[PDB]
């Protein structure tokens, strides 16, 4: 038998905002191990540069995200994912014998694509969510041009696993509603309540 | 002693998230989220790179101890319990949230200590870091590269080279300086903006 | 997602021989980590001493295995298992931030109970295994008073996951036979062949 | 560099297995076993605490590289490819067998480097370690506890105390000595016998 569990939390939101129609954006990638790693980037259209490079211990390097430049919707935000993979004399039985480890790490930040033509900010629209219940699931609708990053969500005084609400669209949660979205200062915006 | 396995976000960091605390606001709230599908016990605290760990911070989080169920999230409440802080410049604090087990073979337990920057921003402060990145000046002393920051903001640097050679980035504290180590014998830099992206390149000679 | 695999082999056999009817035996337990651990022992009758104790980094301590002294068979060897569990100022964001680990470890050596009255050694009896096939499984019989520690086992030129063969008893394997047992020098004894 | 996670058998060692190689036997065979239910790649070699790792040993294992399937076992073949070794005393070698992968989240790989003692025993040597445990003598020098071993065998010590204080055990090489570190300022010991058990206690004054 060999078993492992991981314990920890995500703090806040992290995102890259790509302003639609910009030649591109630059993003830092820092290796914080104290050994060399091979960094490989992909997006999930857009294209990332270099698609593959070496990073020495404690060093950082920039990446350039840039858009193929095909049709994007102009009425709303879109969501892509940037994923960055990192890959890595006398005999002495106290040094040499035992268990040795290696690990590969795959990271993904949201890459948020925000058309220049779009009005205001998520905050200004957070109240305007409305809610309903269907085939057992708690459905939320977002009329907003923005993704609504749900950070606190209670239904009938009991809290529901969060998830963003795509703009001009809907999202369906598993089981009176209150919610807070996440503001552009990593923080939680104010609370709202509604009915069904 | 605590056996350290990896560093941030498992050794690979994209950009840098930050939290702004508007000085003498009653308090900010922060989302915290358990990605596992099993319960996690959560311990939160504020630290300062200039204060001893055991000692208390003027700033405080709530709940300082909280069991969080599978996939669940909770809000933390950061509050300045009346410390005294400068009006003219930013102050850096760190909110850390550590997970732990709730109460033939190996059973391994990985405990993630996740810290994010708490940037204490006086409201008597107009503009943003973006508008001050230029103002950095550079100097070499006892073989260390020294950055002077005349501005009220922290310059969270994300790209640094000195004579083509890339240097392990750090921040430069406001109205203060920072000393970088060298390898061999012109300076170029980018700070990290709010879009979580990198700012423009600037260059200057020592 | 979080996943881990372990890669390694068992070398040879390890056992404690308890000579039936002895006041007891002594066994070393060494902690090879460089930190303190809490050692807890159990047997799977017999009794182990201390049943629970602290062991500093690199230190060792003895354990006394001793038999309740109830009825044991005298015609053959018996098999018990000894299992030993081991349980365990300025802030600086390069030292303090990241992933930290702990692990508990549970070890089991065979505890082989060998009556004084018993003749010879496994080696002298290794040839005397005989084989058959039934409900799809490859069955081995052991007429020997000893456990036969199978270390190499091929059937129709293809190798089968090993397992000991209890004495005056039988064992059934999943799917001409050849086999080697393990001698009391950790090594592999000679090869034999039979039919069905 | 290789990132070390734990030491032997994950930090908790019961007794000590050994392998005896009868000097100038053609070769001994050893069982090796994959407990996982997935394939493992196996790399075997002999080392000497007195030779450099990269350098070749007179002794050799076969196959030096072997993929072993789920739950499978294989025999290794240790052979003295005509080195020159003393007839009068034992020599210690080490057979090491390392496992490796065959060719959102973390994927972790634990690689176990398992070594067992290869005790090269001349046949011109009657008796066993058991019959010589008594012959150890002790001495204190520059604040180290020194064991003299006049015997042809390795005294694989499994219990040592000096003035009630327990000392991290080691072996004492035959017709040679060993130097133990101290903590504070009478000696008691047990070697490890063939039943994998501990021998009788002996005591002596420096």
Swiss-Prot record, chains B, D:
It comes from the Bacteria. Gene3D superfamilies: Immunoglobulins (2.60.40.10). It is found in: Periplasm. Its main location: periplasm. Disulfide bonds join 96-115. GO terms for molecular function: protein folding chaperone. GO terms for biological process: cell wall organization; chaperone-mediated protein folding. Keywords: Chaperone, Disulfide bond, Immunoglobulin domain, Periplasm, Plasmid, Signal. Belongs to the periplasmic pilus chaperone family. Has a stimulatory role for the envelope antigen F1 secretion. It seems to interact with the subunit polypeptide and to prevent it from digestion by a protease. This is Chaperone protein caf1M. It comes from Yersinia pestis. The gene is caf1M.
């Amino acid at each position: 038998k060999f078993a492992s569990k991981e314990y920890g939390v995500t703090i806040g939101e992290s995102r890259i905002i790509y302003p639609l129609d910009a030649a591109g954006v630059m993003v830092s990638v820092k290796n914080t191990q104290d050994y060399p790693v091979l960094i490989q980037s992909r997006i999930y259209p857009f294209v990332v540069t270099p698609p593959l490079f070496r990073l020495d211990a404690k060093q950082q390097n920039s990446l350039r995200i840039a858009q193929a430049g095909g049709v994007f919707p102009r009425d709303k935000e879109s969501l892509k994912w940037l994923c960055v993979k990192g890959i890595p004399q006398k005999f002495n039985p106290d040094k040499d014998v035992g268990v040795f480890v290696q690990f590969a790490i795959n990271n993904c930040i949201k890459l948020l694509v925000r058309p220049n033509e779009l009005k205001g900010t998520p905050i200004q629209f957070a109240e305007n969510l409305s809610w309903k219940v269907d085939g057992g699931k708690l459905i939320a609708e977002n009329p907003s041009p923005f993704y609504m990053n749900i950070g606190e969500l209670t239904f009938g005084g009991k809290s529901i696993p969060s998830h963003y609400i795509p703009p001009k669209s809907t999202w369906a949660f598993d089981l009176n509603v209150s919610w807070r979205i996440i503001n552009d200062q990593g923080g939680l915006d104010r609370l709202y309540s509604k009915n069904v």
